[PDB]
Write a protein that binds this DNA or RNA. Structure first.
Ligand SMILES: Nc1ncnc2c1ncn2[C@H]1C[C@H](O)[C@@H](COP(=O)(O)NP(=O)(O)OP(=O)(O)O)O1
Ligand SMILES: [Mg+2]
Ligand SMILES: [Mg+2]
Ligand SMILES: [Mg+2]
Length: 431
DNA sequence: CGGATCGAC
DNA sequence: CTATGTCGATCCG
């Protein structure tokens, strides 16, 4: 299927559903938010824009002066991870279009099935209309966890303080390693195939070794990115995916050459909404982002344009922080419609128990309890409450969540809440 | 602090 | 029949 035929079959299958109704409503809110930004832009004066331009350029020189090119950052990202695992252990599936998930939702798909536009976050029933030859295999999460542990073992040789972002992806600072490796004999860079082979002393070679070892240990491919910071490393890893790598060399000119025509969307942190908004201001590439830096310092908050300027100058993190403590724990579940109040309370109680059990594992306690409610028209509400002393037992959490749910049931009386999902989250942990 | 939104995988 | 489950950031009131 082709880029126009895809959107035709989706639109055909999605039209008139309650989900679509709610999506239209979400698109209007984004359009309005854009139109408001345009009304803001109309009433900026050339005088303000000049006083901004100076302010921004003073900061841009503060950033530029601190630019660091002396660290080598690698980002590893596995290819079609879940699907690739499922292909590995069932040969029948190879050379065929597959997705891991259910008819309600797909975690991922293999590259074969991606050619038909079936992707992560797509419901299976839509994916079947795009490609009736699609095989949908259920997830085996504990397997993926096991494979992930195999790759993290390899990664730990190259950076003991590597930063796992997910089961399938990670960041490494291979600076201390590259330095040691310059003066290494061939013995310490030699690996046998499962007839031996050696890898060179360069960064491109280190990452060829890593990828090789991953493929030998797991029978799966990864892609990778090499660059002087995390932001850039992450974008390169996507460039030659699947089963390739890319380096931006540590000199200012190569950074800027890469950035020049880079669509802002490929940056991690810029999603669909920020894309559309910035598109409306004639911003699509990272150079265009640099050009509008003054305008952006007026239309967006300090934190936002600070971020945008970092991107426009190809800057990013050059050291990896240890993974900080979690700030919240939550559980939520989608189901066939529940409208009877008594069943809704019981569901909330059950969610409160599950969450209490999960908190017990990490010995966590919190002061804020939030419930989450999605009705059959996909409209989501959250209702929270914060308490003086920390809580953690199923009873305590339910004591709070129960009242938040009562309030919502009462508010619609005599109409019943017709919900398709319910969640409970706990937050406000101690320090 | 409460509620919504964004983005990530 | 049929649109996830999570968590941190950020913005606003
Ligand atoms: N929206 C979602 N919901 C649930 N699970 C998801 C998901 N998106 C991804 N996953 C799960 C399934 C994914 O396999 C896994 C890693 O996410 P990626 O690295 O972003 N995607 P992949 O490695 O499949 O392909 P490639 O990178 O080659 O394009 O996380
Ligand atoms: Mg991947
Ligand atoms: Mg990833
Ligand atoms: Mg992005």
């Amino acid at each position: 299927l082709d880029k126009e035929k895809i959107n035709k079959i989706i639109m055909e299958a999605t039209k008139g559903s309650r989900f679509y109704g709610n999506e239209l409503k979400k698109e209007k809110q984004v359009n309005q938010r854009i139109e408001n930004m345009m009304q803001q832009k109309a009433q900026i004066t050339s005088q303000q824009l000049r006083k901004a331009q100076l302010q921004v350029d003073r900061f841009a020189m503060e950033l530029e002066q601190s630019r660091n090119l002396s660290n080598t950052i690698v980002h590893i990202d596995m290819d079609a991870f879940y699907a690739a695992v499922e292909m590995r252990d069932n040969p029948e599936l190879k050379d065929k279009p597959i997705a891991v998930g259910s008819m309600s939702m797909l975690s991922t798909s293999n590259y074969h099935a991606r050619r038909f536009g079936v992707r992560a976050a797509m419901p299976g029933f839509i994916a079947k209309r795009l490609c009736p030859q699609l095989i949908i295999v259920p997830p085996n999460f504990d397997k993926y966890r096991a494979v992930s542990k195999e790759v993290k073992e390899i990664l730990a040789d190259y950076d003991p303080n590597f930063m796992a972002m997910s089961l399938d992806e990670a960041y490494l600072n291979i600076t201390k390693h590259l330095e040691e490796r310059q003066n290494w004999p061939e013995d310490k860079r030699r690996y046998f195939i499962k007839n031996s082979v050696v890898f060179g002393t360069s960064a491109q070679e280190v990452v060829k070794e890593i990828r090789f070892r991953i493929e030998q240990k797991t029978t799966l491919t990864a892609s990778a990115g090499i660059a002087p910071n995390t932001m850039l490393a992450k974008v390169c890893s996507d460039k030659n995916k699947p089963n390739g790598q890319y380096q931006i060399l540590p000199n200012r000119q190569a950074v800027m050459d890469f950035i020049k025509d880079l669509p802002i969307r490929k940056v991690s942190g810029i999603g669909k909404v920020t894309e559309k908004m910035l598109k409306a201001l004639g911003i699509i590439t990272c150079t265009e982002l640099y050009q509008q830096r003054a305008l952006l310092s007026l239309l967006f908050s300090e934190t936002s344009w600070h971020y945008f300027l970092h991107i426009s100058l190809g800057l990013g993190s050059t050291h990896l922080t240890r993974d900080g403590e979690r700030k919240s724990m939550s559980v939520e579940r989608t189901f066939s419609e529940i409208n009877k109040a008594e069943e809704q309370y019981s569901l909330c109680q059950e969610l409160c128990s599950e969450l209490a059990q999960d908190l017990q594992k990490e010995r966590l306690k919190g002061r804020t309890v939030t419930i989450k409610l999605k009705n059959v028209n996909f409209e989501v509400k959250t209702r929270a409450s914060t308490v003086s002393s920390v809580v953690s037992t199923a009873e305590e959490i339910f004591a709070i969540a129960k009242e938040l749910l009562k309030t919502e049931i009462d508010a619609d009386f005599p109409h019943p809440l017709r919900l398709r999902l319910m969640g409970v989250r706990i937050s406000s942990f101690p320090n």
